[model samples]
Target: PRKKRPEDFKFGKILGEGSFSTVVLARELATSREYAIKILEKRHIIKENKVPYVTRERDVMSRLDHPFFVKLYFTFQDDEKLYFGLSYAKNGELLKYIRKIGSFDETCTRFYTAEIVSALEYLHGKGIIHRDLKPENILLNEDMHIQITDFGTAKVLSPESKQARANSFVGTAQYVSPELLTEKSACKSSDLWALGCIIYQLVAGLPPFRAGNEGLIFAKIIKLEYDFPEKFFPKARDLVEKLLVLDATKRLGCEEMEGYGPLKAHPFFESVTWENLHQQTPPKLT
Candidate 1:
């Protein structure tokens, strides 16, 4: 339910402030439950003409239900800004943990990687595309379990929707899929490409293609040029190689359009039992 009265919230210190919005710590005055409030200025929305972007994000996420996704509890607006009350994942961004550990060991990488696949599988089943998937966009909870956040670039399609692709040239340059660049088309397969990049970063300590300049990165991506050095974990190579294919049709996850089946069945996950992913101990980041 939308809470139109802001007086019901007890605002705490600022959690984060961005160009168009401020995220702050808050709690419900009624029950004293902790929450996070993302406040976006109406003027900034009008100035940047981001009305559609904001609308879609709020609409899509509020209705989504999945353990691996951030929970959007309520939404409402006052005269000057819109308020989004969300579940607070107290551990902070995955990027922070990525750096703190230097690099994630295979155990940590596999644990987290499986969660992402589960998250994406849930979203794709609902005809939604995250459009953005990066370390900075993932947040860990107190248990170190991750929840996919940020839907600003999300796209949702209907059961009778005519198109299966998004053509926007958006997303972080380093994570953009080869098909996203050359074909100007994005589907669930594009997300698998990003998954590969994230997996590579976790185990390899950097993205598959990285350069001081984005143009050079793009050149390498289009040519399907990258390597798994000898020092990198050998198990990660098979899944990464299969996911980072130049052709979307050839991508492992999209080969049968069977969601996480192909990936879960891959050799890299041979040791994983999907039913008990959460029960396994993750790597120590501290």
Candidate 2:
């Protein structure tokens, strides 16, 4: 059954706000459970023709059920708005925590990256591309487990999708793949490119491609001219280089990715037991 208008929820303070939507802390009157309600105005969506993207996000969220992915409880609509009830992570985004800690040590990076890899592998198997894979989209629960959110730029690929390409570029400019900027068809490889950027950011505390202008940045990406500071973390330097490669034909996939020269039994993640990481319980806040 659908919820009744205005009466079904007890809206609390706003958790976050964006251009087209507002995320508010709300409580379900029936079950007394807390949730983050993402409210989108129909008028704005229609004006911007974001219906397709928004609908896709809802559909993708509905089909996905993973520990690292944000949980979507349900979705409903009112006369003027669309509501998405998502699991609330009181601890906030991992980017915020990273900023506080300054930079992640090898152990921390390995744990987080391994979890992300597992999540990405699952998403890829379902043919879903998380075009925007950045720290801001990674949320942390009270117990520090990561949950990825913000799917506005995601796309589902068909088996015949061939190569992943987009007519126009999307995603945070700094995290976009070179092929995407060139107006070429992108495939699963594009997501791998973004993951490389994210992994670099995790250890270096900065994006790999940074310039005063977008044009110069794009040029550098096309040429694969970014430098990795060898003194920082030599092992990670090799991994980042492999991920940042410009040639889609040679981009790394799950199997090859785990075998990347620097990642093979690297000490960076010596503490992580990939199998056990998944077995840990999800965070619960009382």
Candidate 3:
């Protein structure tokens, strides 16, 4: 396929901005269809020797598809930048949405979590692990359905390997798994650790573990020493507790053969009919 052209589209308002990239709302001139375009600077990419990072992201996006994942239409590089045409989630990032609402009720939390679990199952089945998962990476579409984005930190395993041990320490500090910090075996469980952090923040209005010192944050998370707030939803808290297990192999979602079986079976999601989840109403905001 030919590389995408800047002249082929018109860029609109900045949807989001990061250190290395800017996500903009764009219109495909040919079809008049709206999309989000992630434009990354090639200068920074080369200066930092991050070609592998971009390559892995493109590879992962091309191979994966799920209702909760951001769809990559195509990727093309120009003289100065690389462009990723992605499905636009107009409602915006989940972090901003959570800030707007203060927090989600158990229904919304469980609904979003279910969608994430489904996506994770599909990714793991494809030999990819989303090493970085957080509220900021989660987006909401026009109807407020979850769309998981940000795969730059994702890891791809070899065709013959079920698990890959990664010594590279990369991820949002608050959501980083213990194994990633310890330079130990990084399995599908690392993603579940971040999932635990996310669901906790959704229900409790804050991450389960945080501290002023980086080492303190790691220590607290490693020991699983956090406690639920007095005001948190019990069932959601229950699910969070199970996911942040100190032993990754013992976590709720990681143990299942299907990867997401135990998480979907949680009482917090008791009302979710997995088969009909796509047809379910927009999640409640509290």
Candidate 4:
């Protein structure tokens, strides 16, 4: 395969900054199309023990082909850095919109969560587990539809692999599953755990397991501790309850079924039209 060089694109403003990487808005010289190029410094990646994570992110994203997942356009490297040309989510992170609106109503929350479920279903079907799923990792395209991003903590589950669980201390504190804290293992169910937290945050303006510190958060997660707010959507409460179960096996969407039947049939997603969700109009960004 042919390789692209950094000089192939004219970099613009910095879209985001991570511990050892920068996502820059760039215009590919050839296509004149805009993309968010994630630039990771080789030196820092090695020193920080992040080479495997970056490689996994690149590999996982390259194999993905879904409307709700960010597209990886190209990947190339130089002596000092690696460049990942990716789809540009023009509207930026979903966290920003949530922060701006304080919180969303049930209708908006349902719309966003449905799209997320669709994406997660696709990922799990492909034997990929998105170890991290939070508002910050979810981006919005120009049309305000959700697009899941950031795969640095993702794991590809091969059929031949013996161990089904991934034992790692990864992901945000509040979003981490109960099993992840106690068993120290993550699987597809862990992502659903995070999904429940995201749904709560979108509707309530904060994660269900919010606490002053990671220790407190982990304690709450382990105990399955949380209470619904006064105006919490009843259907959403039922869905979150199912998803935040301590037993990962019982999480709302863990079963292997065609089209994720149980999850889509949940009352929380009553009005969602699964197959053509992308073409449906998105909730107005506040």
lDDT of 4 at 102: 85
Each model's lDDT comes to 0.82, 0.75, 0.81, 0.88
The deviation in Å at residue 223 for candidate 3 is: 2.1
lDDT of 1 by residue, 208-286 (tens): 8989888999999999888886667777888898888887877777735465787788877777778765566666765
Show model 4 residue runs off by greater than 4 Å.
Answer: 256-259
Off by over 4 Å in 3: 1-3, 256-258
Error of 1 at 156 (Å): 1.0
> 3 or 4: which has the higher TM-score?
4
- Judge candidate 2 at residue 239 and give its lDDT: 61
Clashing pairs in 1: none
Models ranked on TM-score:
4, 1, 3, 2
Off by over 4 Å in 1: 1-4, 255-257, 276-281
Q: Candidates 2 and 4: which is better by lDDT?
A: 4
* Deviation in Å, model 1, residue 134 alpha carbon: 0.6
TM-score (C-alpha) between model 2 and the true structure: 0.88
Best-to-worst ranking by lDDT: 4, 1, 3, 2
TM-score of each: 0.94, 0.88, 0.93, 0.96
